[PDB]
């Protein structure tokens, strides 16, 4: 539920591997 800080506006988040999901061009985690 909390944004990981990384945005997937054009390119997917690199730190997504920690459990981040792309939402509204922003990667969130829990």
UniProtKB/Swiss-Prot annotation:
This is a cyclic peptide. Keywords: Cytolysis, Disulfide bond, Hemolysis, Knottin, Plant defense. InterPro entries: Cyclotide, Cyclotide_bracelet_CS, Cyclotide_sf. GO terms for biological process: defense response; killing of cells of another organism. Disulfide bonds join 4-20, 8-22, 13-27. It holds the Pfam family Cyclotide. Expressed in leaves, petals, petioles, roots and runners (at protein level). The presence of a 'disulfide through disulfide knot' structurally defines this protein as a knottin. Belongs to the cyclotide family. Bracelet subfamily. Probably participates in a plant defense mechanism. Has strong cytotoxic activity against a variety of drug-resistant and drug-sensitive human tumor cell lines, and against primary chronic lymphocytic leukemia and ovarian carcinoma cells. Has weaker cytotoxic activity against normal lymphocytes. Has hemolytic activity. This is Cycloviolacin-O2. It comes from Viola odorata.
């Amino acid at each position: 539920g909390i944004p990981c800080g990384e945005s997937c506006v054009w390119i997917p988040c690199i730190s997504s591997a920690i459990g981040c999901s792309c939402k509204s061009k922003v990667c969130y985690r829990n």
